[PDB]
Structures are given as C-alpha cells and as structure tokens.
C-alpha cells in the first residue's frame, strides 16, 4: 500500500536480466538469416558468459582505464616508447597494422554469426563479440599511434593504412584472417573464425608475441595485446556452442571436417611463414625457435585440447597437418628470402641476421647456414645495405633463375628453386589467363571455385614498371618526399632514396610469360 513496503537495498544483477533474454525473440516467417549457408540445424544454445549491455561496458571500460593508465602515464614517463630494439619497433609496424585488419574483418564475420544465430542469447553474445573486435581494431591502431609519437622512426607506424598497399605480403593478409572469414558460409564462421582462428592462432599471434616484445624492450605491446586477448574467452565460447550443434546433427556434421581442414590450411598457409619470419628475423633477442612456439600452441595444445578431444565425436585431424608441420619448420625461412629480396615494397626497415643470429638459426634449424645463411651473406657482400651499391636482390634472384611466384589463392610468395617448405608450382591456363598455384589444398580450392579467387597480384598490376615509380606513386616515402620508408638496414645513417632505388633499374616482369 501507500505506507508499507520492503525497504531493503536491492538492485538487479546482470544474470537476473540475462535469464529473460531468450524470451526476447518472437516467431515470424521471415525471422531467419540473410546470408547463404550449408548449415540449417537446430542451434538454440546458451552462452557460457552471461553478459548484458551495461555489464559489457563496465568490464571493458575497466580494462581500458588500466591499459591507458600504463601507456599514457607510467610508460611515457619512463620513455619506454624509444627503449625498443629497432628490429622489433619495425616489426610492430607490420604486426599491429596487419592484425588490425584481421580484427576489423572479425567485426564483419562476428556480425554474420550474429545474423545467422537463431537463439536470442546467441545473438546477444555475438554483439558483444562484434563490439570486442571494434575494441581490438582501435587497440591495434593505438599501438601504432603510440609508436608514431614516441618511437625513433614514426614512418610506417604513421601511415600503414595506405602504404601497406604497395607490397605483396599485404595481399595475403587480406585473406588469412580477413576475406577467408567474411566471404563465405555465415555459420561456418564458427569453424574458420572461432574454432580455428580464435581458438588456435590468436594465442601465438597475440599472446606469445608479447614475450618477444618484452625481450626486445617493448612494453607497450604487452600492455595492449594481453588486454585484447581477454575478450577471446567469450569468442571461443560462442563458436564452440555452434560447433556442438553442428556435430550433433548428422546432416550438418558431414560438412564439418572439410570446412575445418580448408580453414586450418587457409589460415596456416600465411600465418605460419609470415609470423615465423616476423618473430625470428624481426627481432634481436629470440625467445625460442618459432617451430617450438608452433608446436606448443598449434600442434600440441590446440590440436590436442580442441581437435583431439573433438575426435571422440567425429572431428578428424586436419588432413593438411603434415604439409603444415613442414611449413612450421622451413616456410618462414623461405619467406625471409622473399621479404629481404623485395624490401623496397614494404614499410619497415629490415636487418640481415648478424653472426649471433646466424649461429642461433643454424643451431635450431640445421641446414640453415648452407642455404639461407650463404645467400644473406652473399647479398651483404654485394652491398645489400649500401644505398650507393645499386643492388636489390630481386633482380639477383631472376638472374640466377630463382623466380618469385604468387599463389592465386593464398597470395603467399613462392620461390620453388629455393623453398624448403611445402609447395610445388602448378601453372594452368583457363579462358586465356594464366594462373600459378603452389600446393595441393589451394589448387583444389581454385579448381572447384575459380570465381572466388580472382585476386590480382603485384606482378600483374606492376608489370613493366620501374620499382621507384611504383613506390613513389604509393606514397612509400618519408615526409621529405624522397627517402624510402622501407630500408635494408636499421641504422640511422645512409638511408635509401627513390633515386637510389631507380639506379638499380628493377622492372617488374611477367613470371608466367615463360609458360
């Protein structure tokens, strides 16, 4: 009544609201996803981390305040932004901006999972995931933003969103954790984005890398990246709930093993050589051999705790794993050859492995010295670092028959005459167009789905053009308009200019003209 009431202090906890979320949906004929999918099984599941909008913001804002306190107050007062070894400060230009596009594409992929979800609780959880991937996009941007302000070389930290378009390594990044997520079956994103992408590869890409940063003097990236991954617990949990419903329906389960294998290969094809190259060649101090990082996180833990455990319910070990393990051992060394040889097309300053690095490479990868090591040392003697030498190794490769090819599917460079990782060149003509494929798994993807894979490669766009003109047109210079962002050394003197590049006379060929 007007006088008597219980005046005990009460609120409403998030789980009290969350228990009614499932009833927020109502039935009508058009209430279904808009995107094409092979999976139409029952998927009314419960999310393991009950969250509502107000509590989502409270959790993330609390993470942010501690993160930005460390960055803008403590670490700035310590001058930590310029206490990073140059190799690793350059590496973070690539790692943070390339991950940024993966985070950004994860927004769109998570929106497809949001759209294709049928349970209100599942739609609620994927919106939180969508918001997290926005957060991660801005976190990656903030790392390069901070580097731009406090690190001794802001060029490339300050403009990668346009300077990345110059080089070939960026093409493969737009598939590995980007196009490969959002351009396909919407509910299959629970397999490629979540079961594979988030549950397997984010751990070495976002977590393990923080120890390499710390070893090389970088405490900015651990502050941010370790906060990024705290959101991944919900993302992995969202995907697992859908994978369960897929495994439980026999008609849906018959697509799972093929989608899993295609996802694992698509992602590892680029992730394994590129991240391994950035870890080992883009650092001074090594934490461990990259192949051991890969063994620990990819093969043993993910493969055993997720895939091996799911084997009890029909999930098969990826048929491409054998090819992938060979890539884990050698492919990042193959990629280093292409990265060092085509350095003017990037936006980072590279460092040839010194004598201490070379001994470490040969000890942990026996055979490295007689193959890769001899090549790097010959390039150094030819003037790899000297801007007045007129020497760029890509022409050296061609003059010795070491052609570079671009996989039509994965965009990953391939040098068949020098590669020790998995690969063999297949050149097919179809409808008056030549295509180069590099492995058994990608060639099947292209042969079955040619209209999904029409990506132009750098040789097709740059054919017959001189190297310095491509770089100038793509804004690959510092604020003086002439000095390159990219460099073949990490010292402060003797930086290469557009004229230094032009003297070498490097012109892009058609690598498939001989077929």
């Amino acid at each position: 009544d007007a006088l008597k009431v219980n005046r005990a202090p009460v609120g409403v906890e998030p789980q009290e609201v969350h228990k009614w979320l499932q009833s927020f949906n109502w039935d009508f004929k058009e209430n279904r996803t808009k995107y094409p999918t092979k999976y139409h099984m029952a998927n009314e599941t419960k999310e393991q981390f009950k969250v509502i909008a107000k509590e989502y913001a409270r959790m993330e804002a609390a993470k942010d305040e501690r993160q930005f306190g460390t960055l803008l107050d403590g670490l700035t007062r310590l001058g930590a932004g310029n206490k990073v070894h140059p190799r690793w400060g350059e590496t973070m230009k690539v790692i943070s901006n390339f991950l940024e596009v993966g985070e950004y594409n994860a927004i769109a992929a998570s929106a497809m999972l949001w759209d294709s979800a049928t349970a209100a609780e599942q739609k609620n959880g994927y919106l939180a995931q969508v918001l997290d991937e926005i957060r991660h996009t801005h976190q990656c941007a903030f790392i390069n933003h901070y580097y731009s302000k406090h690190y001794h070389d802001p060029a490339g930290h300050n403009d990668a969103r346009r300077t990345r378009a110059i080089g070939p390594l960026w093409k493969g990044m737009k598939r590995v954790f980007a196009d490969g997520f959002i351009s396909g079956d919407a509910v299959e994103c629970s397999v490629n984005l979540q079961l594979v992408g988030e549950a397997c590869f984010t751990n070495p890409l976002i977590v393990a890398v923080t120890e390499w940063a710390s070893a090389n003097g970088d405490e900015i990236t651990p502050t941010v990246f370790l906060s990024v991954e705290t959101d991944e617990l919900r993302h992995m949990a969202n995907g697992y709930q859908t994978v369960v419903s897929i495994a439980n329906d026999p008609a849906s389960a018959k697509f799972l093993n093929t989608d899993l294998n295609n996802a694992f290969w698509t992602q590892q094809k680029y992730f394994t050589p590129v991240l391994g190259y950035l870890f080992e060649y883009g650092s001074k101090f090594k934490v461990e051999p990259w192949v051991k990082t890969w063994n620990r996180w990819v093969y043993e833990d993910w493969g055993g705790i997720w895939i091996g455990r799911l084997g009890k319910y029909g999930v098969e070990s990826p048929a491409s794993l054998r090819d992938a393990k060979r890539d884990a051992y050698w492919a990042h060394h193959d990629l280093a050859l292409a990265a060092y040889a085509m350095w003017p097309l990037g936006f980072a300053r590279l460092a040839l492995p010194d004598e201490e690095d070379q001994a470490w490479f040969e000890a942990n990868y026996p055979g490295w010295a007689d193959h890769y090591g001899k090549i790097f040392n010959e390039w150094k003697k030819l003037g790899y670092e000297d801007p007045k030498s007129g020497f760029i190794p890509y022409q050296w490769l061609l003059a010795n028959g070491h052609d570079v090819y671009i996989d039509r599917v994965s965009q990953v460079p391939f040098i068949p005459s020098l590669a020790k990782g998995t690969g063999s060149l297949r050149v097919h003509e179809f409808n008056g167009k030549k295509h180069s494929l590099t492995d058994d798994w990608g060639e099947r993807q292209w042969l079955i789905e040619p209209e999904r894979y029409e990506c132009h490669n750098v040789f097709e766009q740059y054919e017959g053009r001189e190297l310095s003109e491509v770089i100038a047109e793509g804004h690959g210079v510092r604020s003086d308009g002439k000095t390159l962002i990219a460099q073949p050394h990490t010292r402060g003197d003797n930086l290469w200019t557009l004229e230094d590049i032009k003297r070498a006379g490097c012109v892009f060929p058609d690598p498939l003209a001989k077929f």
């Binding site: 009544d1 009431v5 509590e55 913001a57 497809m112 351009s183 710390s214 101090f285």
Partner: protein, 392 residues
C-alpha cells in the same frame, strides 16, 4: 624453477638494455608523428577518433574512397565481393566521409555506458531503501507500465537485431562503428525495460516481471500490430544497409519510437506518480539523441548532399520515407488505442493532449529529418491520420 627460460626484459635487464641503447639511433628518422596524417579532417583539427577509425576498412579504389587496389583475395561462392557496391542503392564519392559528431571510438563509448551501468545500480539500491515506489498509481504500475512498457522492449529488441546485416555489409569504418554502437544501445533499452520490471517485482508482492504477458501483447495485441509489422520488415525484410539504418532510426524510431518512449511512458509517468520509470527513459532518450546525431551525419551531411549523388540519393530516401512513414503512422494509429485504457488526465490523455503529443513528434521529425532530405510532409494530415485511431 620452470621448464622454459625466464625471458629477460629488454627494458630493465642491464645487458639487453645496453645492447638496445647502442642500436637505437641518436635522432629521429622522420618528423611526421601524426598517426595517419593524411586523413582529411572533418573539423578544425584531426581528432583521435578519426586517427583510430578512418581507413581501417581496406577498400580498393573501385569502392568509392578506397585507397587500395585490385580484387579481393577470396569472394563468396558465385562472386559476391567481400564488400561491394551491390550492398546498397545509395552512392557517394567517398564512403569514408561519415563522422559521428560524438566522435565515439570504442573506449569513450564503453566509458560512458560504464558510468551509467554503475550509477544505475547505486540508484536502485537507494530507491529501494527510499520506499518511493509507495506513491505510484497502482493501475498505471500494474495494467499499463508492466504490460505495455514491457511489450515495448520487443520493439527495441527487433531494432537491435536489424543491425546484424548492417554490421557485415556496410562499406566504411566510421559507419560500422555508428551502426554497432546504435545496436548495443537498442538491446540495452530492451534490457533496461526488463531490469525495471524485475526491480519492481522485488518491491511489490504479486507483481509479475515475467515476459509472458508483454510478449503476448507485442505479438497479438492490435495496439502493437502496426509497430511489430514495421519492425519485422526493417529487421528481416531488407538487406540494403542504408535502408535499414534510415527506416529504423530516422523514420520508425524517430516517430513511433519517440512517441511511445517519450510522449507516452516517460510523460505519463510524470502524471501518474511514477518516480521510477523516468530514470530508465532518461537513458533511452539520451541514447536516441546520440544515435540521431550520427544517423543525421551519414544521411544528411554525407549522402543527401554528396556532390555527385545527392539528388540521386534523395530519390531513394524519399521513396523509403514515404513507405516507412506510412508504416509508422499506421503503427501510431494502432498504438493510440492504448489511451482508452489509461486514467483520463486533462491535457495529457484527452484528445487535445494526444493531438499536441503527435504535433510534437511529427513536427520535430519534419524539422529533424524531412526538411533535410526534401521530403514534403503535412504534419496536421499525419496527426489527423493517427487521431483516427483515438477512442473518444
């Protein structure tokens, strides 16, 4: 001990710090320290919001404004591009032009809502301790608020899910952020309505906070018949992401949504002695005006006035408005039947009071949206159309 090496930190370990110091050059290698200095600033100086957001989407040059080149690496079966011009009828010279006037990247967004989240719980613990619920009109509390304000959460929930395809399909970074933040604010509205109902249940014995009755009203009561039909169409009937954002926020929620939340439940709360509901409607109305600023910038500043496609876009915006305004006027015509169930208060629930409420909503909408895209509208005609559903 431990099996793996304890990695020495380059920042503090003397040996590694000395090696790093010898390798770092004694001078900067460039003086341009403005992160993405080449972004065209909307305001007098480049903002951190723009620096962190703009050109994060890797569009090629064949999507207006893109800085990249070439085809996508992997497309849908059949050839649908990862992002493409086929996703919307509207055209522009640069999809990156849009700017949220609140300049919300992720951190300021969750920072503000976190304040609201924690203050809400402190307010509820004090409100329950105050006993202020004792003076609320019980008929309003039990028969109007609990049932029909509860039913309104399903409108907010449907508008939330309308953004799912937008979050995938839209063509730029600032647009994607605007859409997703707007989606969370909508599902927040639906959760906050339920939170108030669950809160009242702890204070009033016999008060049922279950969604059974609200859901039955939303799905079968003719009072919400037009509204639910409109929400189902905006959510699941179209995929043009510009149509969804425009129909959802600029037409339906700006007319029916504003009348239901502000003119009915918030306003009548302050004539029936409801000291609780205004705390919750304060949030949804704050969220509406923030969302409107961003929606206004996308469709008015950028699209309706794009140098090459302004009139082209207004042609589609005019056609969409004519269709979804009719839906919204029919929704309001159904909704004003709820006044037959409320206690009569002169100037608020009589015909003159409802007429003035419709004049505010339709009048504000003409100024805020219709005038800006060249959509002619007779406010009195639309008011009289809705009043045809008012029971004398």
């Amino acid at each position: 001990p431990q099996s793996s090496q304890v990695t020495k930190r380059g920042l503090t370990d003397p040996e590694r710090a000395a090696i790093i110091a010898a390798a770092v050059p004694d001078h900067a290698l460039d003086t341009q320290r403005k992160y993405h200095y080449f972004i065209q600033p909307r305001w007098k100086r480049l903002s951190e919001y723009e620096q962190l957001s703009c050109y994060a989407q890797p569009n090629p040059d064949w999507i207006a404004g893109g800085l990249d080149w070439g085809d996508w690496t992997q497309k849908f079966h059949g050839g649908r591009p990862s992002w493409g011009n086929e996703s919307t009828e509207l055209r522009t010279t640069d999809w990156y032009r849009h700017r949220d006037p609140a300049r919300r990247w992720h951190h300021p967004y969750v920072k503000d809502k976190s304040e609201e989240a924690r203050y809400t719980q402190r307010f509820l613990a004090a409100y329950s301790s105050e006993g202020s619920i004792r003076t609320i009109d019980p008929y309003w509390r039990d028969e109007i608020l609990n049932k029909y304000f509860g039913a309104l959460l399903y409108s907010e929930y449907g508008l939330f899910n309308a953004h799912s395809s937008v979050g995938r399909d839209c063509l730029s970074d600032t647009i994607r952020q605007t859409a997703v933040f707007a989606a969370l604010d909508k599902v927040d509205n639906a959760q906050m309505i339920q939170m108030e109902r669950l809160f009242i249940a702890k204070l009033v014995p016999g008060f049922d906070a279950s969604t059974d009755v609200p859901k039955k009203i939303w799905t079968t009561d003719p009072i919400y018949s037009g509204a639910r039909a409109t929400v189902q169409e905006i959510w699941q009937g179209v995929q043009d992401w510009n149509e969804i954002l425009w129909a959802g926020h600029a037409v339906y929620d700006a007319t029916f949504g504003q009348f239901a939340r502000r003119e009915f439940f918030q306003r009548l709360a302050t004539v029936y002695g409801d000291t609780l509901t205004p705390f919750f409607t304060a949030q949804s109305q704050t969220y509406f005006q923030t969302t409107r600023g961003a929606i206004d910038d996308l469709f008015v500043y950028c699209l309706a006035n794009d140098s090459e496609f302004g009139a082209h876009n207004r042609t589609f915006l005019n056609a969409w408005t004519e269709h979804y305004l009719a839906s919204s006027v029919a929704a309001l015509k159904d909704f004003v039947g709820l006044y037959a169930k409320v206690e009569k208060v002169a100037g608020a629930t009589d015909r003159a009071g409802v007429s003035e409420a419709l004049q505010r909503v339709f009048g504000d909408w003409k100024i805020d949206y219709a005038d800006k895209i060249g959509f002619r509208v007779d406010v009195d005609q639309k008011v009289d159309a809705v009043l045809a559903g008012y029971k004398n």
